[PDB]
Every structure is written in structure tokens, then in C-alpha cells.
Amino acid sequence: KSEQLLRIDDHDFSMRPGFGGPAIPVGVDVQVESLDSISEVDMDFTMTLYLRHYWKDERLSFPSTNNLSMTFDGRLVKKIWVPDMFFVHSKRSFIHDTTTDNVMLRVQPDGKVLYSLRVTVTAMCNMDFSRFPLDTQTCSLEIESYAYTEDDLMLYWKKGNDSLKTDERISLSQFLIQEFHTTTKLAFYSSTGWYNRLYINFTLRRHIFFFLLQTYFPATLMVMLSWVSFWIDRRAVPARVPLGITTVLTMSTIITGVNASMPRVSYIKAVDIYLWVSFVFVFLSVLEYAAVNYLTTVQERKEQKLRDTHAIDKYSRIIFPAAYILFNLIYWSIFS
Amino acid sequence: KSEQLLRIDDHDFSMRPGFGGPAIPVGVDVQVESLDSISEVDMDFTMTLYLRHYWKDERLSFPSTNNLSMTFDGRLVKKIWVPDMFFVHSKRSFIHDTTTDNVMLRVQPDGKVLYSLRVTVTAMCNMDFSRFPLDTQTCSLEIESYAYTEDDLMLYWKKGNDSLKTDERISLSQFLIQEFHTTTKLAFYSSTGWYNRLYINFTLRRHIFFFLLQTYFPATLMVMLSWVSFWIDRRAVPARVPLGITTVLTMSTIITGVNASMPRVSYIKAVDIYLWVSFVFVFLSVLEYAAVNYLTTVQERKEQKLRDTHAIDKYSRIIFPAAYILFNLIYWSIFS
Amino acid sequence: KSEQLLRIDDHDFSMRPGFGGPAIPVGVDVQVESLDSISEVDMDFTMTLYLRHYWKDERLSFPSTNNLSMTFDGRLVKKIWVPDMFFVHSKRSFIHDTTTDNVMLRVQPDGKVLYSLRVTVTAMCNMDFSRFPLDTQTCSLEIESYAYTEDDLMLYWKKGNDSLKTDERISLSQFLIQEFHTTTKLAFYSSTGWYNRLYINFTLRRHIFFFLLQTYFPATLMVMLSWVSFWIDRRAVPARVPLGITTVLTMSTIITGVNASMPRVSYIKAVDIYLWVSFVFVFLSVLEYAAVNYLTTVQERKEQKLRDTHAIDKYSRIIFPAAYILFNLIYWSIFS
Amino acid sequence: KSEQLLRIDDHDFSMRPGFGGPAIPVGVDVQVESLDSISEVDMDFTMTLYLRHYWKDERLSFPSTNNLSMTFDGRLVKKIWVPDMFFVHSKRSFIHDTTTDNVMLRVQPDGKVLYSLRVTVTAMCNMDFSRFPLDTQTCSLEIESYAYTEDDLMLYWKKGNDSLKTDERISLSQFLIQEFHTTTKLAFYSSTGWYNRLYINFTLRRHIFFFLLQTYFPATLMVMLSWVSFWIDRRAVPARVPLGITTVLTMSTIITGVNASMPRVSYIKAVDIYLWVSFVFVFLSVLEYAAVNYLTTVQERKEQKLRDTHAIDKYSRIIFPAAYILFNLIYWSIFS
Amino acid sequence: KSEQLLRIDDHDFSMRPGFGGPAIPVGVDVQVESLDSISEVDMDFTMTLYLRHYWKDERLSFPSTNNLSMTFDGRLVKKIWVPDMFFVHSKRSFIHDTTTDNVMLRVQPDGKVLYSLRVTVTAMCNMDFSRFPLDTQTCSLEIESYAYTEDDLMLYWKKGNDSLKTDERISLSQFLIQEFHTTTKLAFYSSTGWYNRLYINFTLRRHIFFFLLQTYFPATLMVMLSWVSFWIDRRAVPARVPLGITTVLTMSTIITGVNASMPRVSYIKAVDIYLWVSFVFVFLSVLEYAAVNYLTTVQERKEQKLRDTHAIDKYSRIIFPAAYILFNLIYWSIFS
Numbered sequence A, B, C, D, E: 001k002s003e004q005l006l007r008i009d010d011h012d013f014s015m016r017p018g019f020g021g022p023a024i025p026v027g028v029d030v031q032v033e034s035l036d037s038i039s040e041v042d043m044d045f046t047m048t049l050y051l052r053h054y055w056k057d058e059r060l061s062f063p064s065t066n067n068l069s070m071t072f073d074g075r076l077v078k079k080i081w082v083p084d085m086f087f088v089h090s091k092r093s094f095i096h097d098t099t100t101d102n103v104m105l106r107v108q109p110d111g112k113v114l115y116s117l118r119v120t121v122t123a124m125c126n127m128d129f130s131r132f133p134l135d136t137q138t139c140s141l142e143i144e145s146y147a148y149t150e151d152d153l154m155l156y157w158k159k160g161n162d163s164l165k166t167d168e169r170i171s172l173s174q175f176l177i178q179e180f181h182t183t184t185k186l187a188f189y190s191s192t193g194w195y196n197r198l199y200i201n202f203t204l205r206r207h208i209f210f211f212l213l214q215t216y217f218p219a220t221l222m223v224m225l226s227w228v229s230f231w232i233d234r235r236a237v238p239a240r241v242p243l244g245i246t247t248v249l250t251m252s253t254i255i256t257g258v259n260a261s262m263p264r265v266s267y268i269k270a271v272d273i274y275l276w277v278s279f280v281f282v283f284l285s286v287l288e289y290a291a292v293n294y295l296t297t298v299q300e301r302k303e304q305k306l307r308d309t310h311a312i313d314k315y316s317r318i319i320f321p322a323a324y325i326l327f328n329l330i331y332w333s334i335f336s
């Protein structure tokens, strides 16, 4: 029996190696296999990865006439001491178990141990949509010991920044992913003390041109279309009125359609500001002709009682586009 | 073996400490890690937290030449007595178990015990949407012993209002969160007796300006647009009629779009009252011109058989805006 | 050890108390904590409750110098006989287990037993939507023994109609709940015999005024709007035609929007009958003017070749509203 | 102890009864409790049922002074041999376990055994939507032994067609259910040999009148409405043009609304053919008036330079309805 | 006892057969039962299959007077050595367990073993939607040993390309499936070494004609409809203007409806290019008439102050269709 080469029953494996003395160092490496999904309303993401641990335990040393190591599956884990890592700020997680538990242990003749397992985790990520669709988001995954403070267990990245590897084909449907790197920081709990925490960081960006074409283009086109009425004969009332009211209806249907396709986040975003300013411009173009028609009727009635282009159209033809251009300059200087 | 320092087999751990005498006090602290989601149709919310217990048991005392404590994981829990807390009015819950069970026990030389675990819970919350979008909601999470009455177990907050801590970055996508605090109250069950219950309370609010801009603004603009027809020449029938009918169509599409984006709650809310009153105003503006056209035709026919602005337009130009202003004053005095 | 006060190993607990003789009576009480959700397309509902059992077993009697009882958790259940209740016509269910199994046993000195547990269940409920939105639904939850016929186990409500309690704040988002009560009935299985079955009954209703305002009001308004054309000068063709076609478009958009917001049930309901009759009325109003225009043109051409209000408008002004009123009287006398 | 009346430890229950000789016959009965749901996009359905097995085993015979049988729950199953049935072509399944495992065993004095359990299963069903909404679907559930060929285990329906019972109130929200019956057939696996397979068959149909009223009626009405323009004076251009373009807009909104309410199946169905032919008819009605207006203008210009009803309208008034009637005759002769 | 014919307690089954020498070959066969679902937003697919293993172990040989083999269920697996296969790049998986675990073991007298189990797996598949709806996708499922390198375990397809079988009725609702085949390749891990990997490959395609009819047809029809205005009398302003604005509204509603029915992928696809070019064509047709009307008014005013078809219409009647045809030729030569 291979489990008799390790004196399992001759040691108390409820205590850590080196108990009573200096803390035992534990090194960590991570390989990221895929990014599975992201939820903008609930603000979280899901990842699948391999987690590997390295440490030494003299109680597991065994004699050998060669330098070959012994390999075990997950059934040995319950018989020896292993580190208790957990994921901070996670919502749910599990260890894969088909066709059996995806866990491995390798023991060297001198007592060095490698511990490897495959896991899927869902973690929280606070997001800010104020600058949508030009926003940038930063996310992280955090690893910590549950029960051992830094006086008993010292947790560190085994090879610094070389400890993190990512799959060549990692991708998300609606985002671009960039800038993977690692950091470390100490955390304090008033209940028990100081702990080491490890971080994996990355950044997300959107495809700007899709949103420009889908949203900003039609609204600008409809605003430009509302300016055509300034060049139409003011005596053609049955042509001037329906054009304005139909332009208002078209802009309203565009805004409703755009609202239906964005994530349901109930606060003000940059694209909403652009759309509602455009709507106001279209509304004012109808008020302009109402004023023109009333003044012309008044003048004709006065002339008959006593017995060319109106100035308002001439000024509007210049004033409306200049104001829209100025608004665009200010908007794009503010929101980049 | 560390489990032989505690005389595990020398005591009956199916009975409570102090059995037969006064009740044993148990103190509780809570740390809230995140708020995961909220469901308005099903009326519930989800939270992740750390739960910690404090009590003393003389049967667990062990000799020591120093003042160091001993730490165990979840495997020891089945061998000793622990308190049986559960969450009242919950729908589902679980204890996290990656990479192992997230449970810890620490025992002092004199028998003081700390018991800590990490849990996720979904709890019910009755909501009232009568004042939407200006509504305010209050929610709570409740903790109680399953099997021990106040004569056997005395449950209390360990440090009063200092027993509750919350994460600095706790947030929800569509709500603002404020005013965390704790309370206690006694509950009675006719089957078994009186029990102590602990509460965690907080309040939720919406972003008002987003809803004002998205809903109240367009409806007011369309009502103001329907008043333009009162200043148009009454002889221009092919201009007056299509304008009114198209305004009605636009208002209908706005209301349908707004209904499509709110939570599916099937009873009358304040925003519905505002929208349908506005719709009625638009409808009456079309009836007004129908009456004007009929009366003018009657007069012309009578004059020919025998062989300026109509008064109705003049009165409507004043009466419609004043009534709308009065409705707004009453509405906003009622709904704040 | 408390489990040695009960002679656990001195009895066969695979057989029922009173084996070989008369059936053992078992009394039941229920406390309903909440109603969690309802699904109209799948026709089911979800509930959380406390289930309590009462019976006597002389094999569990123990000596005592007082009248104190002994309390155990779920670990003792596997060592003694307990009743095997299950929920008839259910789709899924589970027993809550945080922070431990929510199960309790209390044993009196003379052998009386109380058995209590907390459970969540999803149960089927056939619904009929013919009269929507004026429909009423009745639902039930059923409890039965799996393996014991009425000759071996007699199941009954412990205190009649006083055995059922409900929470003061029980509610559903889209329904009103009323009339909780209990019944019993005998059921027959050809495979094994007769069994006792217990029932919990309740009724659901909708909020009528919300549906009236959202659906019936706009359709009636559009039908009334289509009657305006009967008072407009028949010589104004470019005003009469667009009005009718735009009214048809508006009614179509209303019907599509209403269909999008109801539960996806694919058979004919009362509200569909009302909407499509209204649509037919709007269609006929356009055919009327087509006939009027053709006849007028024919008359003018005939008069020129040889070289006031048309009767159809005069009759339509009376006939259309009277027919609509008659339809409403018949509809509301049929559907209440 | 009742388990000592059966000599459990005196037999090897890892081998089948009759090992080494002829195959052991096993009879099956099924009772269907409900149909829980159906998914058209994923092509599967869910059912809850009772499964019962009958066979004889002389090793379980016990002496008795009467003819009473002994009953056990699921804990005995692990100690004896039972048949290993599984569901072919299923996606997921489970055995109900509240308040305990829903499993029963009854043993007669001579060794006859009844084995009963309650299960829920989701099974695949390939569907064809070419003739929607006039399609018919056939579904089946299949039962087979995992490890025993027909040389070792003979599986059959215990009472032929009387072995299947269904609940009196079985129903689905959007389908009608008819024609339950059973069949059997032999299946071959190249890895191990021939196996017996049992089938449960049934048929599904839709409610035709709901779909006729919701889809076919409005499209026919709009096609008939487009024919009104053929009777309007050709000199009324501002009446003829807007009518045609608005009819096109209305038909487009109807088609979009209809597409939004059907299951998302991305290939051509019969109702799509009907809708797009109707759309083409509406388009051609606008081209007709364009031609008429151009020809009239040409004639007037020619007459002035040199210095009644147009034939196209007269022919269209006859030709359009006859072609639509012919299309309807062909369509309904093809699709029933 | 059949488990005593195999000397289970006489061997260490924590080590592989042939330990210390050449690697043990393991052959694999696969039978695919169904394809359950596909998710375009999350980029994954789900499959159900049978997995079979073949190898030899002299420690399991048993004496026999015949050539009959012995069969066991899943309970024996924990007592002997078996290979540890797992699925690479998977998100979740499980082994079916109704009515018991779907696992079988067959052992020949000379020690040959067959190991069979039924499993469901969800696997990732990166997709590219640039050419939608004319895109083609390729997917794969991968199998590998967790803990044994190629020096200890040699994994191969048992019968080459004949090792893969697929069900005759395998189908997906929205895709066509073709070209199943197998491959193999060696993979390197810096942590432990070289491993053998097996692949199952297949291809997916869409139904092109459904998308052509639903999307490309209406847009082309509306572009052709906008050209009618070039043949209408330029003096009929109240006919020319509303036609153009209503055509713009119709095209906008078509684009919104089409966007609502495609998978929510936020980057530019081929069908979007076609739709927005068509929209631009419709917009330019309105600008054309604006210019014509202004120039005519200028000429009339000049002539009166001093006291036929306009050229722009004549050129547009030719230029617009030729440009649209050229765009179509380029588009369909690029996108096939």
C-alpha cells in the first residue's frame, strides 16, 4: 500500500507544518482558461481557472532508491493537512467533478508537495455607466486564507508577474479585454488580525463605432431634416405643418427603440443627454412656423381692413445650425 | 492528537452547556459583504455576509503552559454542541464550500469559543408601488433560534449598535441605500413558547431626475404642442385635422413605450394617472376643432340660402393652459 | 448519553407503533409563512411553510423524577420510526438546511412525540383564462402518506379548522388572496388500496380598474374619434381620407401593444373580442366615406354631361353610436 | 428484526435471480401524474409519473403463519438486487425526496416483489414548424435497461395496453393532447448486443381560430382597404398619395408585431408566406396610381402645347380582387 | 461473493497497471445521443453522449470453467483503478443518476475491461459574427487525462475514424449540422509535461432564404418606393412632401424591428451595412425635392418682379437606380 510509505497514522494532521514556530510560506500560480459570462444589471462576471499550490512538509518524506515521485487523487486530501484558500467577494463557486473530482497531489521524496484543482467562480464588480457608451471598467479577483493569519501562514505569488498565464483565445462577445497583471496587499480584520491578499486585475472596453452608427447618426440626420422647412414657401400650410409633426413622431420612435436595446440601468447617461437635446431642437422648429403663420395672417387681415421671405425664416436658416454645431463642440470636448 | 486535549468522549454533547439551570447567553456580530440582487416582481433581495457567535463552555477547557488557543475547521462541529441559528422569512440559502467549507472554530484555554461562517441568503420584502416613481421601501433580515426558547438560550447583540459593519463599496444598480441599524423583539409561538429575534434594517430610494426626464417631460411637451392649432387659420381644414390626429398617435406611442419599460406590476400608479390625464387633454383638443368647423359650415350655408377668429378658439387659448396648470398644482401638492 | 435513556437498540424501529392491531392516529397542523411566486404560463405556485406531526409511541417512554421533556435535532430521525408524508401533484420541493437541518423532535416522559420541519414546495394549479381579466382561480395543496393505507395509519387535522394559520403580511404582487380553509377526502389506488388525503384551499382575484384603464378606455376613445368625420364637409377629400387611415393605424398599434403585455396564452379571451369588434367599427367608418365620395362624383359628372349634407352621413351620425351602445350592453350583460 | 427474516447475509445480491439460466421476466406499469412544461425553441417536454416493477425472487421468501406481506422503504434497496431502468434520450431527471425518499418495496411470503417510485423527467422531441400554425407533433418517452441484454432480462408491459393510466385533468396551456398508447421494439448496440425498449406515445395540436383571428384577419382587411383608392377621383392627388403610403406603414407595423409574438424559429413558415404576399399586393396598389398620375399629366401638357375614369383604374377594380381570390384558393388547397 | 473472485484486498489499486514500466494504452469510443441547446451571446453548446474505455489489467483475472464475463455497477469503481478523463474548456457537466448511476463495468476472464457511462457537458465555442447572416462556425469537444502524462498513459482512438457514431435524428432548431470527424494532438504544460488530447469536430450553417425574405426584401422595396416621387408633378407640394417624410418613418420602423429580433451582439455586421446604406438613399431623395421646390419658387418670383419637367428630376430618374445597382454589385461580390 502506497499510503503506508507515508506514516499517516504517526502524525497529527490537524496542525500545520512548523507549528509553534515561524510561518510556513505557500506559493501560488494561476492559469485562466476562459471568461464565461458577464451581467451588467447584477454587476458580476464568471471565470474558469486552474489553481496550484506549493509548500514543503517533512512529515510526508519517504525513502526511495531513486528520485521518482508519487501521485494521488482527491481521496488523500482528507487524510493530510492542506491550505484553506477561498475567494473574497464571490457570489458562488464549485469544483468540477466529471468523470471524477478534478484534484491532484504529487509528493517528492523530500516532502515537497504540489496541489492542483480546477474551479469556476462568479465574482462581484462595481460598474459606473455615467459615460456610456464611452465608459471603461476595471475588475479583479481576490484570493485569501480563511483561518490563518500572517503569523502562521505566509501567502505569496511564486514567480512574481510570471505566475499568471491566460489562454490565447480568451474573449467576450460585447467587450474588449486588456492588461492582465497581479498585485498584493495586507488586509485587517478586527475579529482576528492581519491577512495577506492576492489580486488579479484586468480592464474592459466597448466597440465605439457600432454605437455611433446605431444611435448618434439617425438623431443628427433627423435634426438636419427638420431644417428643410425653412426653405419651403410659407404659403404652403398643408405642406409645412404635417412635415414638422411627422418629424417629431419619427424622433420619438427612434428614442423609444434605442431605450429598448440598452441595459436596464435607471440613471442618466451621456447618450440620453444627446438624444433629448436633439428632441428639443426638433420641437423648437415647429414653434417657429407657428409664429410665422400667425404673423402673416395678422398682416393680411390688417391690410384688407384698411383697404417674399419672412424675416424669421431668414434668421432661422443661419441660427439653428450654428447653435447645433456649438452644442456638438461643447459635448465632445466634455465627453472626449 | 489535538482532539484528545479536549475530552470529547467524556461528555454528552447532545445537551447544552448549563443544562438544567439558567439560560446560556449567546452574543452575535454581523459583517455584510455585498448586496447581490433585487427582484421587484417577486419582492425579495439577496445578501452575502459573515456570521459570528460567542459563548463559553467549561467542558472544552484544556491545560496549557501558555495562553495560546487552538483552531479547527468544520470537521469538529459535528462532535460538539453549537447554537442552531436560522433565517426567518427566507426563501433559500447556502454555506460557501470552495476550496473547503468556510467554517472556523477557535477555543481558548478557559473554554471561550468563537464560531464563524460565510453565508448567502435570499429574503422576502413586501413592497408598495402606489407612489412610483417617488416611493420609499424598508427591508429587514431576521435571525432566530430554531429549537431553544428564551428559558434555555438568551440571544443578544454582542456590542449593541457597534455589532453591525458594512462594506465601503456596497451598492445596487437601480437604488440608493441608506440608514443601516439593528433592533430586537420577542416573538411568541403557540406550539412552543417565546423566542428572541434580531433584526437588520435599511432603506431604499430611486433616482428621481432620470424618471422625470424619461416620462414627465415628453408628455408635457406633447400637450403643449396640441395647443398650437388654436392659433392656425380655421379655414385651413387639411392642416388642422391631420395635426390633431397625428398628435394623438404620438401620445399613444409614448404611453406604450413607457409601459414596456416599467416593472410588470398590475395596479394603478401615480405616473399612470399623469399620463392618462395628458391623453384626455389631447383628445379634447380635437373635439374643439370639430365643433368649430361644423358651426362655420352651418353659418355659411345659412348666409348663402338667405341671399375673423371664432369665439371658441379665443376662449380655448386661455382656458386650456389654465386648467393644465391647476391640475399640475393639485397633483404635485398630493404626491410631493 | 441521552440516547441510552431511550432503549434504541431494544426495539425494531422498522415497524410502526401498534403493529398488528388498529391503525395509529396521526394529527397534523400547518403554519404558512409566505407565498413566493406564481407562473401563469406553466400553471403552478410556490409556498414556504411549517409542518408539525403528533403521535404516541410507548417504546420511547423513559423514567423521570420530574415532568421535563427531551429535545433532539435531525440526527435522531434515522434511528426511530416517523411518518412518511409527501405532497401530491408537486413538481419540486426541499427541506431548509442553514445553518443546520431545520428539524426538531420533542419527546414527553410518557412517549408523546412532536415532529416539526420547515419546507418549500412548488405545486400545480390548472387555470382557465376564458374570462380574462375578470377570471377567478382556485388552488390547493394536498398531503398524503406514501406507503401506509387507512388500515395502518389514520391521518387527520388535529384541531379541525383551527389547525391552519397564515402570516399577517402574506401577499402576491399581481393578485388578491382570500378564503383559506381546509378539507379532507378519501382516495383510491388500484395498486394498494384506500388513503386519507388533506387539502388547503384558497382563491385569487385581479385588480379590475387597472385593466379597464389600460385596455378598454383607449379603444373606446378611438372608436368615438372615428365618428368625427361624419360632421366634416364632404368636399374636403384631403382631410377626410388621411383621418380615417391614420385612425386605423393608431388602433392597430394599440392592439399590438396590448398583446405584448399579457401572459402568452394562445386562445381567445374576452378582451380580444372587445378589441377586434372595435377594430371592425373603425374599418367600416372608412368604407362609408368611400361610398359617399364615389356617389357625389357620379352625380356631378352626370349633371355636367346633361348640361348640403348627403343622406348617408345623416343616417350614419345616428346609426353608428346606437349599434356600439347595443354591443356594449350585450357584452357587459354576458361577461358581468 | 424484520431484515433477519430475509437471509440477507446468506446470498450474493450482486447477481440476478436465475443467474446462469433463462432470462428473468420483469413487468412494468406506468401512471402519468402531470405534464409540467414544453419548450419549443429547445424542443423538449417535462413529465411527472409513477413507475412500478414486478418480478419474483426465491431468495427473499420467508416463513409465515398467515398471508401477510412486509413493507420497506428505500433503505433496503441497497441490500438486495433490483432492476436498473433508465430513460433513453433524456436531458435531466430526479427522484422526489420530501419528506423522505418516495420509494416503496413490498415482499410476499413466496418471494414476489413490487417496486414503486415517483420521478420527474425532461425528454427531447424533434419538431417541424413548416406548416405553422396548422402543424401536428408526435412525442414519445422511452424506457430501457442499462446493463442487461435480452438474454439475461426480459422487459415487457405487464397488462398490454391496460398498463398505462393518465390523470383526468392533464393539460397544457397552449396545446391540445390526444391519443395516448404504448408500443415495444428491439434495439441493437454494437458494443454489447440486443435490448428491449418500451414506448409511450401521444399527439399535440394548436387552437386554430385564435391564430386565424390574430393574424390572417387584419392582413386581409388591410389588403381590402388598399382597393378603396381605385374609386377615388384621380384629380385628388393630396388624397390618393398619403392613403397608399399610410397603408404600407400600417401593414409593416402589423408584420413586425406578429413576428414579435411567435416562437423564435429561424426558417420559413406558412404564415410568413401569406403575410409577405399581402405586403406585395399593397405595394403594387401604390405603383398603379403613380402610373395614372404621370400619364394624365403628360396628356394635359400635350393638349395645352397643341392649343372621366382612366382605363387603368377600370381594369384594376376587377383584376386585383380576382388575383387575390385565386391566390387564396391555391394557398388553402395546399395547406388545408 | 463475486468480489472475492477478484483478489481485491491483495493488490494496491492506487497505482496504475504496469507501474514502473512502459505506458498503458487506453482506447476510447464515443456515441453522441443529442445536441441539447446553443447560446450565441455566451458562445457555448450542450451535448449528451456515451463514453467507453478499453484496457487490460492482469490483477483482475479470475479462473473460469467457461468463457463468461462478470458485470458490475458503479459501486465497484471505488475499489479498483480506472482512468481519470476530463473535458477541456468546459463550463459544467454531470453524470446521469436515475434510477441509479448510469455506469457499467464488464470484466473478461483474462483481465480485459470495458468501462461505460452516460454524461452531459456544456463547452465553449468562440464565434465570429462579422459576416452574419452568411457566417459559418466550427466547434469542437476535447478529452484529456487530468494527472497522467504520455509516459504513463497512452490515450488513442480505438478504431480511428470508425470510433465516432452519431444519432440519425440529431438536429438544432436554427442551424444545419454537417461534417463530423475526429483528430488528435499533443499538448504541453510547463507545470507537468506532455499530454495526449482527442478532438470531435463539426460545422454549423444558417438558412439563408429566411433572412433574405425577412430583411433584404422590405428595404429594397422601400428604396424603390422612394423613386416614385421623381415622376410626380412638381407643382403638387402637399403630395410630394408627406410622401418622402412617411417613407423615412417607414424605413426607420423597419430597421428598429429588425434590430429587435437578432442576437444582442454589439459590433458591426454585414446586414447593418446594407440597411444603413438604404436609409441614406431614402434621405437623399427628400433633399432632392427640397432643392427643386426652392429653385422653382426663385424663378417664379424673379419673373413676376421683371414683369415642363425640371432638369434635376430628369437626371435623378436615371442616376438613383444606377448607383443602387452598382452598390449591390460591389456588396454581393464582397460578401458572396
Ligand SMILES: *[C@@H]1O[C@H](CO)[C@@H](O)[C@H](O)[C@H]1NC(C)=O
Residues within 6 Å of the ligand: A065, A066, A067
Ligand atoms: C537522483 O537519483 C540519485 C540516485 O539514483 C540520487 O543519488 C540523486 O541525489 C538524485 N538527484 C536529485 C537531484 O534528486
Ligand SMILES: *[C@@H]1O[C@H](CO)[C@@H](O)[C@H](O)[C@H]1NC(C)=O
Residues within 6 Å of the ligand: A160, A161, A181, A182, A183
Ligand atoms: C507586475 O507588472 C505590473 C505592471 O503594471 C505591476 O503593476 C506589478 O507591480 C508587477 N508585479 C510584480 C510582482 O512584479
Ligand SMILES: *[C@@H]1O[C@H](CO)[C@@H](O)[C@H](O)[C@H]1NC(C)=O
Residues within 6 Å of the ligand: B065, B066, B067
Ligand atoms: C498569560 O500567560 C501566563 C503564563 O505565561 C499566565 O500566567 C497568565 O495568566 C496569562 N494571561 C492571560 C490574560 O491569560
Ligand SMILES: *[C@@H]1O[C@H](CO)[C@@H](O)[C@H](O)[C@H]1NC(C)=O
Residues within 6 Å of the ligand: B160, B161, B181, B182, B183
Ligand atoms: C441603534 O441605533 C438606532 C438608530 O435609529 C436605534 O434605533 C437602535 O435602537 C439602536 N440600538 C442599540 C442597541 O443601541
Ligand SMILES: *[C@@H]1O[C@H](CO)[C@@H](O)[C@H](O)[C@H]1NC(C)=O
Residues within 6 Å of the ligand: C065, C066, C067
Ligand atoms: C408533574 O410532576 C410531578 C412530580 O413532581 C408528577 O407527580 C405529576 O404527575 C406531573 N404532572 C403531570 C401533569 O405530568
Ligand SMILES: *[C@@H]1O[C@H](CO)[C@@H](O)[C@H](O)[C@H]1NC(C)=O
Residues within 6 Å of the ligand: C160, C161, C181, C182, C183
Ligand atoms: C372549515 O370551514 C370551512 C368553511 O367553508 C368548511 O368548508 C370546512 O368544512 C370546515 N372544516 C372543518 C374541519 O370544520
Ligand SMILES: *[C@@H]1O[C@H](CO)[C@@H](O)[C@H](O)[C@H]1NC(C)=O
Residues within 6 Å of the ligand: D065, D066, D067
Ligand atoms: C391464506 O392463508 C392460509 C393460512 O391461514 C393459507 O393456508 C393459504 O394458502 C393462504 N392463501 C393464499 C392464496 O395465499
Ligand SMILES: *[C@@H]1O[C@H](CO)[C@@H](O)[C@H](O)[C@H]1NC(C)=O
Residues within 6 Å of the ligand: D160, D161, D181, D182, D183
Ligand atoms: C395498444 O393500442 C394501440 C392503439 O393504436 C396499438 O397501436 C398498440 O399496438 C396496442 N398495444 C397492445 C400491447 O395491445
Ligand SMILES: *[C@@H]1O[C@H](CO)[C@@H](O)[C@H](O)[C@H]1NC(C)=O
Residues within 6 Å of the ligand: E065, E066, E067
Ligand atoms: C471458450 O471456452 C472454452 C472452454 O469451454 C475454452 O477452452 C476456450 O479457450 C474459450 N475460447 C475463447 C476464445 O475464450
Ligand SMILES: *[C@@H]1O[C@H](CO)[C@@H](O)[C@H](O)[C@H]1NC(C)=O
Residues within 6 Å of the ligand: E160, E161, E181, E182, E183
Ligand atoms: C478521419 O477523417 C477525417 C476526414 O476529414 C480526417 O481529417 C481525419 O484525419 C481522419 N482520422 C483518422 C484517424 O483516420
Ligand SMILES: CCCCCCCCCCCC
Residues within 6 Å of the ligand: A268, A273, A276, A277, A280, B209
Ligand atoms: C443629474 C446629473 C446631471 C445630468 C444633467 C443632464 C441634464 C439634461 C438636460 C436635457 C434637457 C432636454
Ligand SMILES: CCCCCCCCCCCC
Residues within 6 Å of the ligand: B268, B273, B276, B277, B280, C209
Ligand atoms: C383605484 C385607486 C384610485 C386611483 C384613481 C385614479 C383615477 C384615474 C383617472 C384617469 C382618467 C384618465
Ligand SMILES: CCCCCCCCCCCC
Residues within 6 Å of the ligand: C268, C273, C276, C277, C280, D209
Ligand atoms: C372560439 C370560442 C368562441 C369565441 C368567439 C369569438 C368571436 C369573435 C369575433 C370577432 C370578430 C372581429
Ligand SMILES: CCCCCCCCCCCC
Residues within 6 Å of the ligand: D268, D273, D276, D277, D280, E209
Ligand atoms: C424555401 C422553402 C420554400 C419557401 C418558398 C416561399 C416563397 C415565398 C415568396 C414570398 C414573396 C413575397
Ligand SMILES: CCCCCCCCCCCC
Residues within 6 Å of the ligand: A209, E268, E273, E276, E277, E280
Ligand atoms: C468598423 C469595421 C468596418 C465597418 C465599416 C462599415 C461602414 C458603414 C458605413 C454606413 C454608412 C451609412
Ligand SMILES: CCCCCCCCCC
Residues within 6 Å of the ligand: D290, D291, D294, E224, E225, E227, E228, E231
Ligand atoms: C422600379 C421603378 C420604380 C419607380 C417607378 C415610378 C413609376 C413611373 C411611372 C411611369
